[PDB]
Symmetry: C3
Subunit: 117 residues, 3 copies
């Protein structure tokens, strides 16, 4: 797929997702939420959406990823919403791997008002 | 698919998920977890399950969605488990968009006790 | 699929995921993150990855699952990264169901540097 930016790395065919990198150093105090810039824009393949999920390396530090849905039509830069849910202050260095983008298939169902049985 | 209730909106074919709406006003203090009612019941299509995930608009306020698996067989009303992980009190207004329901395919594997190599 | 260990249970064909069990009693104070051992190792089927997600029963207690991606190639024991984001201390008993493993398909896209339009 077409991407713009160097904040996303090539993955092995066997890997489920692509690593995403912090475009700049971020400091997070306990309880702080910040939208971390990655500098990448992309064109997701038709029929799919992207799921942003946290890396185990950073999750084990007590940092979570919030939100996380990139719709096929999104064309803006990708920012990752992160919160420090631990009781310690953390510094994310520039170009540190902060999350992963995983491509998943889309399913459209029409909604029919009825009576669930 | 068959649904009952007006707490879920039609999505564009290109969107990955359907927006879910709070059935009533909810107040969340820092650290509080509450199960927010949406008023909708549904019949998921055979072969799929539903993933409830948070909206970026609310995730950026420091609210997270916990749990989040709706099995094909679930027939009860959908409630979203939300926590305020920020250091500020938040009020969710009635019929505010609080999360998204995304339909994903099911995979059944039999479990074979062996030796992973 | 081949698994080793008794910390994972057989699921009904209709269920989206398999329940994962704590291999030992864990105590979590508010704000603490711990990697909970399950004792299981597995060989995921080629073409898929596994998503670890939290159970509604434990999510409603204010416990979250962080990280959560098992790549097809992972051969080590599965540990679940959990945090107590509530304001109350919690004890997870040995062999308590703490999360679910859901098998999802893999999608590989080559990355092409271009201009997103
Ligand atoms: Mg979370």
């Amino acid at each position: 797929m077409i991407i713009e930016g160097d904040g996303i790395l090539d993955k092995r065919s066997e890997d489920a997702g692509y690593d995403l990198l912090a475009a700049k150093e971020i400091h997070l105090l306990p309880g702080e939420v910040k939208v971390i810039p990655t500098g990448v824009k992309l064109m997701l393949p038709k029929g799919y959406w992207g799921l942003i999920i946290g890396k185990s390396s950073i999750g084990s530090k007590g940092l979570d990823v919030l939100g996380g849905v990139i719709d096929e039509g999104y064309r803006g830069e990708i920012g990752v919403i992160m919160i420090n849910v631990s009781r310690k202050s953390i510094t994310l260095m520039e170009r540190q791997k902060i999350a992963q983008l995983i491509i998943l298939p889309c399913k459209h169902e029409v909604l029919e008002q009825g009576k669930v049985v």
